[PDB]
Symmetry: D2
Subunit: 389 residues, 4 copies
Amino acid sequence: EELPVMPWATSVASGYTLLRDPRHNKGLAFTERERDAHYLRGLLPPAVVSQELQIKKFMNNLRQYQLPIQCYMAMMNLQETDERLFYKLLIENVVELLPYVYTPTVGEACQKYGSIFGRPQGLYVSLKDKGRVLEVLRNWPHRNVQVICVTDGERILGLGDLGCQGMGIPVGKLALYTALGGVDPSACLPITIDVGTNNEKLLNDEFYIGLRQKRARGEEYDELMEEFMAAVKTFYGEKVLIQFEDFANHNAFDLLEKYSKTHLVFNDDIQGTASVVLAGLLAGEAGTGIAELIALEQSNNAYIFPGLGLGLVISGAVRVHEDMLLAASAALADQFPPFTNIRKISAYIAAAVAAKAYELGLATRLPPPKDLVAYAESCMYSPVYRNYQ
Amino acid sequence: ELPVMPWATSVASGYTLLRDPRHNKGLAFTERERDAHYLRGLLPPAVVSQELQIKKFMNNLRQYQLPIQCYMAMMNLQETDERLFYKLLIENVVELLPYVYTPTVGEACQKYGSIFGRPQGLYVSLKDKGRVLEVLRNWPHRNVQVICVTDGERILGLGDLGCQGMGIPVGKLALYTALGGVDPSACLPITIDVGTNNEKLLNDEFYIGLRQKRARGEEYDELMEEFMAAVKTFYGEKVLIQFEDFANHNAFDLLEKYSKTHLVFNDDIQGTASVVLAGLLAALKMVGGTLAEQTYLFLGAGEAGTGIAELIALEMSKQTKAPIEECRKKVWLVDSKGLKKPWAHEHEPLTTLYDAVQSIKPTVLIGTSGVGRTFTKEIVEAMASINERPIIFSLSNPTSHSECTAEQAYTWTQGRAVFASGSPFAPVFVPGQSNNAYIFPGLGLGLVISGAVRVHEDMLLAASAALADQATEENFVTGSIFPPFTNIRKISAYIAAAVAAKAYELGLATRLPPPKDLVAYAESCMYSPVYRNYQ
Amino acid sequence: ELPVMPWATSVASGYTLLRDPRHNKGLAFTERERDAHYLRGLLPPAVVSQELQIKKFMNNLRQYQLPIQCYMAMMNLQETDERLFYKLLIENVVELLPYVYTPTVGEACQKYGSIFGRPQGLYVSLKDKGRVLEVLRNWPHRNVQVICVTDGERILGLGDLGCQGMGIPVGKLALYTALGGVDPSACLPITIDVGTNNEKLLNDEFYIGLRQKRARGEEYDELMEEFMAAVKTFYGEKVLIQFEDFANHNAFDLLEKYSKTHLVFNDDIQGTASVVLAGLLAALKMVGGTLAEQTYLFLGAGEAGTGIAELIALEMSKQTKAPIEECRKKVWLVDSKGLIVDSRKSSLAPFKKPWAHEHEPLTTLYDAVQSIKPTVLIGTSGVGRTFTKEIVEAMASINERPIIFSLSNPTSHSECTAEQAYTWTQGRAVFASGSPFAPVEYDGKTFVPGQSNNAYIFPGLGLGLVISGAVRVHEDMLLAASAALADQATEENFVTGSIFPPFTNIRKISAYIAAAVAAKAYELGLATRLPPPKDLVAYAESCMYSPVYRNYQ
Amino acid sequence: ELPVMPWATSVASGYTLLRDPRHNKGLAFTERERDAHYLRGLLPPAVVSQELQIKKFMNNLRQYQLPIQCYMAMMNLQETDERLFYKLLIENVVELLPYVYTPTVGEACQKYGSIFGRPQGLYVSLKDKGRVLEVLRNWPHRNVQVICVTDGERILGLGDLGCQGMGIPVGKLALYTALGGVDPSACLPITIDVGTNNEKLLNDEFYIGLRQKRARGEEYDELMEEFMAAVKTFYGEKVLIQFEDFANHNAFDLLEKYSKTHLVFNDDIQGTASVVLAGLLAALKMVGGTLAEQTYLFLGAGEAGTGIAELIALEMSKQTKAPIEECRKKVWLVDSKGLIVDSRKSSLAPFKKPWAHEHEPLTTLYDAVQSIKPTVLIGTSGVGRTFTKEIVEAMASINERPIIFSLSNPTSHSECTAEQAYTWTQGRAVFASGSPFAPVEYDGKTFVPGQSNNAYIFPGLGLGLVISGAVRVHEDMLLAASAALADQATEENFVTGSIFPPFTNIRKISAYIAAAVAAKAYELGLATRLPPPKDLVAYAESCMYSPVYRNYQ
């Protein structure tokens, strides 16, 4: 078409290019044959160390950090250096690590985001990108995005407006879509929309990473959000999931009402909460969201969103329907069970969500497979290291 | 005839640029650099200066409870934003030296397998026999100037740490860059893995080396010969090979052999001799007297022990104009068996150090035993009884292995001792650290900038005299014989100029003709870690 | 469990961008693109349009004295600026087809080693046994849609050219892209090298293949089985495997076996059948008559001869509702031993047996023409000048408008020329050839003989399978393609003597063929791209690769 | 403070390796190299040596009908496999010099836009004012040793070809590599585009330059000053800047100005004087006599005529220890108005005045020959057939062995042919020409007249400057190069009539010239690679780039 394209060059990763790619880096788990074939001989010490031994070593060091924020920083650095090791470690130690990678330590990470800023994660779209949102998306090196987790940072947990530093939440949430729901991490895209912040402490902080101005509202905000949602559809198509999160309530409801008619969209604070509380049973975002779903039919949202996201992706759903939330709740209640078997739980939720998408005529991956549970499991990302040619 | 690696070059942009520690500026990339290199959106909107990034990193680093955690964060920084790492290190050298170098670097080697993070340096093992050149070809920097090589057999006073000895050459080269201005892209840390005799490491599931006992004799010699031939073939005649943390017999044999055919330096032998001699020249400028009027007694007669003693005798002969054999008579050493061959003078056989202190009556006492608490209250009180201002050097590293602490040296002598240590000590009197990092960066720079092809003993004398010339009344009043590390870049420039002048004078320099102002020339050659602006 | 290749991605700039034929625009990079991708100074100041670059290339190409030199310049262009190559090919298709396809491509295969330039395609040899999957992993495009594979044993009528047979699939795929709109990044030309029986090539110091005689039997079978299993493992169930230039027994065996397990077709058998049936339907629309009323006589009874005869009998059975066995009765073929007859049955190759009707033996084509009195004569012999003056005059005595197809390639192998067909029939023959012939001036008229080029069918058939997500080729898709092409042949081309529409409107023709093939895939329950779009012609067009330059960020 | 380009390095493999002309070996990659660099399957099975690739290339090249087609194939090879290009060029230098260099390179400049293929060199235009350093940063080789630059105002005898003048520095640098052993990665061809006064090019839709008239004065000066400052800033004090194909006055001004601040050579001015002086020293070695004993007469008193005359007078002053003014006394020149004499001084261009000796005015060359009775006659007029039968016969009457140099280029402009020189002197002329003539059969002998090709001198001169780390060019280095080239002319070439040794041994010749130039740099205190090696010939040879393929890890 007429729109500009990024010219991408592809080559075999070897040497430090391979060691510095978190998607391909195995660290000391590269075998002697892989080291010889990819020009790593001498760049690594002689020992070949399995994924399991690397997990053990990482957990031993992590437990020696005095502060939870230091465990969070070591986890983010791991995610951005050896992705497969990060996901396998997270899956195997989910109960111990969820408080570090997610709530509550992820909230403290957003408060201190500027001061602890390390390896770059996610994509930032600000007011300075007006008229250029598509151009910003073209810098993202993964073409086939399936799940976007987006925030404007206005309502981070119970911590309020954390502006551009709200990025820690979509980054944390997507790690859970991968670890708990098996969504491929290369298909995940955390986004922060920076329209300024009303947080005076952050506006005075020399380490703040966002636009140093008060929060845009009304038409200026609306125009950027409309350009963003149009750019996401133009570039990623009709099937991309846009998961809104940690937006202020009036905005969260307006965004959900508007974009749920034109895109595949859901708001975990409104809909995920309503779904998990209903599954449990069997006046804001949560209060009215839950009340509505009750009338229609640990309370952690991570029991529902990973399986729900997986169910939408595997069915090629183009819209989220309230009946999918009812199906996700019934599937969870049929299984609260612990987070130790979250992958099996997510497969059952994904199969129930996918079945509803087919029944409502909202699925595009046609015809539906006969066993949706086995199909969901076959689609789940496995963080076991690959063997290299 | 030899195979070559086909390298492809392209403009770094996007994540390729962000993941290259040599070019990554993090949030310091300007809006124009972000637009030009496809970073827009990959980074949050703020542009954050190198100075703000230093402040942020130091704030976080000070919150780590353990020194090893500070070391780990420093290694990760070196391997993510190297300019930031070097600028931070230079500006906070006094605070950070104990974390990036001695003593924490020793603990890093002990735990190296368990804390393994980003890959650093090059490993050459017994499995690479007949393929050493092929291994060097994998190193992505063609113009190597300084190689720091070890086999991990003598790590500080911690003994055999095998392949885990890599932490020392990695730390040493960070100091050649930060303190001496050697370009980091021209630095190559190497560990030679021939196995280890450390049974705990051989049993450790996290050990990173060959899980075998050390090779010795012909098998070892053949690998070392192939390694030294490969280094000359690939990097030429002017590459500096700095040997470090080798066991004593091996260290002396390697130095004797390769100093005739390559530009080589053994920091444990020669760097130590140079820094201690400078310390002695400075101490004599603070307390009075000459080198010839002194009586020397060493505890430990290995690399450091005989290394220092040999240079003391050399400087004494240049001043007195007398033969070196005569200058050796007033220098004594005590090994594990009691009171290497040029030092065995005619004397009654004594076993304990205390009995040697009473019989010899030294004015200078130097500890290089690698054994802790060997300088007892009795020995230090005897030194204070024999001399008005006894000169005591307790050099054994790490801190637990030190012969005595600074607190002990000043308390037992009633504040009369002239103290210097190998380990970093807190003020009591500001104890001087007889740190080799005062000499090797400037010495290394001096050899590189002059295009020296051989190290000569007179360059060690020139390096010692230039460091002593930097020790003024400003540091003497505090009780420190050495100038502080705060002005290490200026000190290194003076050392480099003195070493380069010596190379030209001896006909060993190849960068001809010599520049007129060698100090200004050394400074102009020093790597600056200020961020570059990008096209 | 299987090993994977670790691929690294980065923004192409400078010489990396200039040396990538997929992104290189040469002097068409704008000043803004040059600034953004570090090209400023690497190129002279002028910005030169794709249209000006086409003109400049065509000017230079017309100055080469030898057709092989035009072919070499075309291959070098394909491997330096592929968008320019495809746009130039589409715009100058009539002029360039003889250089990039038959006949020049036959000469290119004969001289392939001596003219070897930029690497094209993938070679899988006997030395790759047990490592075929590893070889496929070196191919830098993961989502392959169309594979054109050869072992080079039957190149045109030239026989065995071994590893140098690679010129054919490379040429065919450029036509799937230029004429059918298949994305070139989704095309994969493959040569399977099992050696060659060509003694001249084995003695040639410039030969590029294994310097051995052809492997046969078990060793060959095991490599082919490993190859077909590797293609399915790596590219999935929907990849199209188009077999080409295989010798006849092998071609029929490969087609019978792999058509049950993969999406396959053999262009020499099925593609030829489909274009020739379209030509016959067009000839009958031009001159009147039905398929059933005809009497057919073929010279040559191999891949093309029997493949075409089968599709004629099949189309006839659909039109008449009669059994296919009854429809084969007025179809006759002459091989190297003479007329194929019932008395010869025991010694015939199986593909010949359905055509062995009861009849006295006849040893020459002339005798077969006089005894059988065909209304349609088709040459697929590989032997030039076999449609003699006497044979063509007998056709013109037997028929008011004899239908004569001289399909053997390259040109020197044609059974007769267009000049001969029109002169020898006093301008009454309905003529078509495999080789391009110039217009013929006869009496006061100009005759433009149609070329029964497989490229009229395979690009659209390939696109139709891809866009519908077809998992199997069905014979009814070949009939749908033939009917779609014949529907494009009108009075506009008939008035000039051409039974085919010209290649100038090939993109539109391929869209109609693709839509008819895709409709057939949906109707037969063989399509996986569900649901079918309502307008399959508009859908086919929307899927076609456009070689217009992109604008770069 | 200045911005830097962030460069990323990685191991080349697959198509990245095949598309890099510096590393690409084509079919010469061994099976082990193919396995190690992910090429298995990307190439056909045969491993074909560098020698076989040279043979294959030469076979194809000889089949092109047009010389420009040979040139295009050569440029495409240079930009696909440079080691193959250089090894082929070295081995076939006599045959290929007329295609890669003069005269075909001039035709290439005239048609540069219409034949534009793979990008070569760097373009700096008026649009780059204030950004010249930024343009140099896009060049992917950091350690440039030799820059060949033009503004294309005077290409051979073809005039102003503007931006299309790039073909000359590209050709000249291929010769610094092939003939002199300068590493090609250290060579940088540059065209400065300030517009063109060529109306045919400004009207040509395929012109590649700024479509404007040529800038002059301050605008031109400011770009040239920024360019020369950028070259020093980025490449240092030791980079060689070789000016070429500039108009006479501009070339003079640029050489006078930048010779004081940079390492600067103008091949047209300085290389020409050096090669003709070498021819004269060799002619005198062949037939006997000294420079001082000769009487010189030139037809043409321009850049070449006066440049050569000055270098002859300079060498004569060194040999005799006499002032150069005394050495100019037996050197005479005839311009378009006749003999340059003292009485004409008021109307002469200042550069002609040192040659205006006292003498009666003479209007024809014939009268000048009869009156002056030269022993040496040199044609630098640009006017063909001005060395008439009468003139050549008079030279043979005056001298037993007349030395006749007909240096005007191309052969159509030559003052006389080799056939004419030998016939008109009964085989007694010592003849050389600027352009090649075929051997001459006269009496029972074969005469091979030598050519005053600048390519004999500049490769070795450039190498001599590079290897010694010279910071300035001195006129004595030109004398050392001439003496070194003449020393290579032996009885082996004299017996055939050639005063120059053949180009077949050019690598050895260049090593001797390089050693003599380097020795001169050390002697004059202009060399920085200190101390000088003891054997400068062996040192020059050890520095020469060898185009034999590397083995890959």
